[PDB]
Symmetry: D2
Subunit: 261 residues, 4 copies
Amino acid sequence: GFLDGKRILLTGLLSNRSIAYGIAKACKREGAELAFTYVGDRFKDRITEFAAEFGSELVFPCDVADDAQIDALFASLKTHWDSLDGLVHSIGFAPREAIAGDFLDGLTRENFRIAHDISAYSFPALAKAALPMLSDDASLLTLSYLGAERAIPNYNTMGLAKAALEASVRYLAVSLGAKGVRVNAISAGPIKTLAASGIKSFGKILDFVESNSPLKRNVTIEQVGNAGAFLLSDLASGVTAEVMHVDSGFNAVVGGMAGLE
Amino acid sequence: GFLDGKRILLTGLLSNRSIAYGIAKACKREGAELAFTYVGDRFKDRITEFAAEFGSELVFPCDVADDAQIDALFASLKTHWDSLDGLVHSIGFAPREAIAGDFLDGLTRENFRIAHDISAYSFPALAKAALPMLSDDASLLTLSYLGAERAIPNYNTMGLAKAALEASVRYLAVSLGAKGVRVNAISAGPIKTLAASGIKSFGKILDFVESNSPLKRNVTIEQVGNAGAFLLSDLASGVTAEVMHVDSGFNAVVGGMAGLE
Amino acid sequence: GFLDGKRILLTGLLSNRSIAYGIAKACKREGAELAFTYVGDRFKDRITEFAAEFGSELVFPCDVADDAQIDALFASLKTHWDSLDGLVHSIGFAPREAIAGDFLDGLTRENFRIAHDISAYSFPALAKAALPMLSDDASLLTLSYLGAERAIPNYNTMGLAKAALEASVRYLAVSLGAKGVRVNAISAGPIKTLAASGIKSFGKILDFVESNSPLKRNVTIEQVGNAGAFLLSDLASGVTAEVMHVDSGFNAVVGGMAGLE
Amino acid sequence: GFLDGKRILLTGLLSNRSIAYGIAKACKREGAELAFTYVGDRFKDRITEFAAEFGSELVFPCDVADDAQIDALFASLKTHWDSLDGLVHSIGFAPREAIAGDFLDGLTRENFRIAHDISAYSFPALAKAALPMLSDDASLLTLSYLGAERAIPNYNTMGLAKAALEASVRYLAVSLGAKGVRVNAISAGPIKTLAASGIKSFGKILDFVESNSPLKRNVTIEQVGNAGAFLLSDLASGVTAEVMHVDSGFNAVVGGMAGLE
Ligand SMILES: NC(=O)c1ccc[n+]([C@@H]2O[C@H](COP(=O)([O-])OP(=O)(O)OC[C@H]3O[C@@H](n4cnc5c(N)ncnc54)[C@H](O)[C@@H]3O)[C@@H](O)[C@H]2O)c1
Ligand SMILES: NC(=O)c1ccc[n+]([C@@H]2O[C@H](COP(=O)([O-])OP(=O)(O)OC[C@H]3O[C@@H](n4cnc5c(N)ncnc54)[C@H](O)[C@@H]3O)[C@@H](O)[C@H]2O)c1
Ligand SMILES: NC(=O)c1ccc[n+]([C@@H]2O[C@H](COP(=O)([O-])OP(=O)(O)OC[C@H]3O[C@@H](n4cnc5c(N)ncnc54)[C@H](O)[C@@H]3O)[C@@H](O)[C@H]2O)c1
Ligand SMILES: NC(=O)c1ccc[n+]([C@@H]2O[C@H](COP(=O)([O-])OP(=O)(O)OC[C@H]3O[C@@H](n4cnc5c(N)ncnc54)[C@H](O)[C@@H]3O)[C@@H](O)[C@H]2O)c1
Ligand SMILES: CCc1cc(O)c(Oc2ccccc2[N+](=O)[O-])cc1F
Ligand SMILES: CCc1cc(O)c(Oc2ccccc2[N+](=O)[O-])cc1F
Ligand SMILES: CCc1cc(O)c(Oc2ccccc2[N+](=O)[O-])cc1F
Ligand SMILES: CCc1cc(O)c(Oc2ccccc2[N+](=O)[O-])cc1F
């Protein structure tokens, strides 16, 4: 397909319901060669299997809290791939209390720190670490959420982190653009994933979106994935510094103002 | 490719440098069946040829100033196509003085009217007229410009018109979304086209973008086209009500603040 | 107060519940000298009284559909005021069907035209007509609504018109800024006014905002008015081309995603 | 004036050119009672003097890196003021290399951390710490910059930090709004201040803004201050979760596309 020959590294493939699984599946379909990261030796087995069902045996540990692992990841990858065409950043984290209840109740310096460190800093950090082996027409993708633009209940500290994440997309696009590398994000709609379990009221959000988005339907990892593959391909070569919504248009409306119909 | 079987109507193919030419070329490449509109019997010959080099003999007059022609277009098309999968709105107009010099000097009620009528109203108007023969997973595309979001010199009345155009994308996405039809826009960067001749300082804008966009390069009708084809395809089924920038990221920076280096 | 000596013309004072009434009241309070417009000889009596309770006897007919009345308004005003410090644009209109039910059902070329003509074009048109007697530090205010930014049910064609209105703010700010005149808008929240009667589901919107805005309360013409007076004063001299929300922060959240609590 | 009786705490008054100095001066003028913070015992003398020229003897150390000082600040203030009506957050920091040259060259985990910790986290942290003594109609103000919205040369890591700062405004507005407290920001234009010295190319930016903003002029701490006082007053009671530009409209244009005139 439109990603033949492209070599792409995917982070954040945790289960068969992960957004990164859908992106991987679309990229593979379009002819990319894939490689994967995992967090912690315990998960090496599960990820090696995932990579195998995508025709890949390239897996590398990367806890983004750890500078050593970030540098090692790309030293390791470089032994297998001379150059890297795509990077998918599809990871994040915030302590329970930082994404539950009131925004201030759950706010601490450490909660703020961790959330921004893992969910925002890790993207340009991965970009920097990958730069030497990035090809000139490389493309970097990250995943964001509407909670960066507007206040969403329980999203809280992540919203702050995502807004910084979206800003890093713009600074990264400038910093890497002379060379030719593009940098974008997808602002995905609610998808039932493992991470989604940390958002109490996710089911409520999910229902609301289904009811109120222009398409009257929620998105899938296939849809987010197909847009992933697009942004990562040369079809999207005129596109950088862009936060693309894949949320059935939910971002663009003001919904739920029917009154107990 | 990813538009096999899709039947798509393109407006605004005036020359081999038109944005609509690039979109057509990408769609054809991806396996779409195409049909075209032209303005005025004089141009029937030139467009019939364009359609022929895309493997199509379906051409239909449509001056969007004229309700009769809008209704006739889709009565005519319906005799050849049972259903319509894609509509490309790539047209517009504003009187010379409305896009030259000071915004107020060139402002008149008629200039305002014409500009909005042709450049903004015609999109949902085409959408409405096409609705009966639109398939459920149809996709409608229009072209906008950064002048809708921020004041650009000489763009003037068009900026107002484009902002209304971008709003119509959102209302159209809601209005047609229950049925399943998606509605989006591409905010394209400066491209040397016939319409571009109406913008004095286009060459200056073109230079500035090349110099200051993250990618340090201007876009092409191929790049805008590839993103067209994407939005029009099922790869973009999670995407509606979206204004997608295809401008090498220019929208996202504040450029040219080097001082006589 | 902070508008002493300022001479300000207000449009759109229809009743004691009009947004323009609140703006007038705040400006008067802050020491402005006021003048008013009315639509149609029938309403001359009601407006002359309103002006009297603001200490003013300056009233002038202005149907913004009519170029003659726009030019006459400022010829007339010029006989009483040597110079103009403030202009409040607080007017608009769209045919019933254009702001009811589905966006496409109510869409016609004439409905589009009228809506944009009265609600959007009239602002820069008033600005142009007023320019000769505008003082260098003059300030122009218009009123918009969140329906310009995001699709709101029933708002429909007005949303398109408001988006053009908000764009005209930016082009006007550039066009009049060298001279020193500022141009801004207030994106007001839902307020029970005569115009509000044209929006079926206004009560529903009103309830939703009260329930879901950060302040858990709706705004008043006093609040919109106080922000009016601010923007019109020299306190706001660093501010132009700005769309300021006065809506208890409603614009900035994603509300109502509680599920049948 | 319009802040009589209000008791307001100001952070970030470092010199007579600080933005916080201008805000203080406007608030005092409008009848507020003021109190100030300073960083480090060395600066106690300079700030005690500043407070004295505003009729205040209330000064309190607060290095926002330090949880102990944040809690102590409001224990101390509470001994003098029963309740707090206003808080001005006008502080920040990023290591030299984090705001110089390329965005990636200067990027480190620690640089990211410090920048976000001091420039973004400290605002809601101050809000939380102040909450018990905040009155119901209290108002909190922070200062941001256009670098949060679009990539600006050399702004780099601060841009990320400011975007998180602006998001915290929205989450804080929701979290504190039921009680009635408002939370806003001013996105100020370039002003020659001590902090400005950390931005090489500040003079270039300053020149560009003067040349290209709609008002053809830069802003002052008086202008930012007057808008401060506004947001902090009951005139702005309909306004929360708002990022208000005070930058002569620079944000709203695309400037400098004249070509070597
Ligand atoms: N699911 C949604 O509704 C939704 C919507 C919009 C955006 N997103 C975003 O998409 C991305 C993926 O999340 P998801 O929905 O696929 O759920 P997920 O749980 O499947 O993926 C989360 C990933 O975060 C990774 N991760 C956590 N801490 C890490 C660390 N220290 N180092 C490396 N990786 C770490 C996990 O390993 C996991 O793969 C996230 O950035 C998330 O914010 C999700
Ligand atoms: N070229 C650029 O720099 C640029 C950038 C962003 C957006 N756009 C937009 O892309 C679209 C296409 O313009 P272009 O750049 O391809 O130049 P173009 O001249 O090739 O296309 C303009 C089209 O407008 C059509 N048109 C004018 N009046 C019409 C009417 N009454 N009825 C039907 N069609 C009419 C013309 O026939 C022509 O096909 C426009 O909407 C334009 O605003 C252009
Ligand atoms: N009330 C709300 O909820 C709300 C919210 C946001 C914005 N707005 C806007 O505020 C402005 C004022 O409306 P309102 O709420 O005060 O209701 P309103 O009915 O009191 O004011 C409407 C005004 O429109 C004027 N008008 C209509 N046609 C006109 C014409 N051809 N020429 C001159 N004037 C004409 C009317 O005379 C009337 O004064 C409008 O622009 C409206 O869109 C209202
Ligand atoms: N000057 C500009 O061009 C401009 C433009 C937009 C926004 N801003 C913002 O306005 C705010 C004020 O900066 P400024 O322009 O007045 O310059 P400034 O140097 O006068 O103010 C900076 C302040 O940061 C304070 N600060 C630094 N580290 C601190 C810490 N650990 N704890 C407490 N305070 C600390 C300093 O004490 C100083 O008062 C900043 O947030 C800045 O980002 C400035
Ligand atoms: C409500 C939408 C949503 C957004 C996320 O960023 C998301 O992913 C996370 C949520 C909380 C903490 C960390 C993550 N994450 O994987 O980045 C899950 C979701 F369901
Ligand atoms: C500066 C970028 C630009 C934007 C357009 O919308 C554009 O197209 C038009 C310009 C003026 C009037 C009408 C059109 N148009 O074809 O819609 C051409 C351009 F060069
Ligand atoms: C839902 C909020 C709202 C917005 C308006 O612009 C408004 O004013 C109008 C509504 C429809 C047509 C015309 C106007 N108007 O006075 O401009 C009334 C409202 F209640
Ligand atoms: C270019 C405009 C500008 C923005 C700032 O946030 C600014 O303030 C800082 C700049 C760098 C680091 C820290 C600060 N700060 O005081 O928050 C100074 C500026 F000149």
